Amino acid sequence: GSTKADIEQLPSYRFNPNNHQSEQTLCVVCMCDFESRQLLRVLPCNHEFHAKCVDKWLKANRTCPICRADASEVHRDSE
Ligand SMILES: [Zn+2]
Ligand SMILES: [Zn+2]
C-alpha cells in the first residue's frame, strides 16, 4: 500500500477505458497494460503508472521513469 499519508501522496485515479483522456495505455515500469479499476498515480510531469510500480521506483530514484523529471516536492521554506 501507500507509504505516505493520503494528503502527501501523488494524485491517483482508477483507470477506466471508457473515459481515459491520456495518451498512455501501458505501465512502463512493469511493462503491463493499464486495466479497468487499477489505481494509477500521476507525476507532476503528467506521466502515469500503476501506483505500486511507481511508488517503489520513486523511493529508489526520485525521477519519473519516462522523462526523468524529479517528482519531489517543491517546498516553500527550503530550496
Ligand atoms: Zn506497473
Ligand atoms: Zn515524466
Residue numbers in the entry: 387 to 465
Question: Would you copy out the relevant sentences from the publication that reported this structure?
Answer:
RING family ubiquitin ligases (E3s) employ the RING domain to recruit the E2 thioester ubiquitin (E2∼Ub) intermediate to catalyze the transfer of ubiquitin (Ub) to substrates. A cationic Arg linchpin (LP) residue in the RING domain plays a key role in stabilizing the interface with E2∼Ub, but the identity of the LP residue varies across E3s. Notably, the position of a cationic Arg residue in the RING domain is conserved in most structures of RING E3/E2∼UbD complexes, where the Arg side chain forms a network of hydrogen bonds with UbD and E2 to stabilize the closed E2∼UbD conformation. We chose the RING domain of RNF38 to use as a model monomeric RING with a native LPArg.
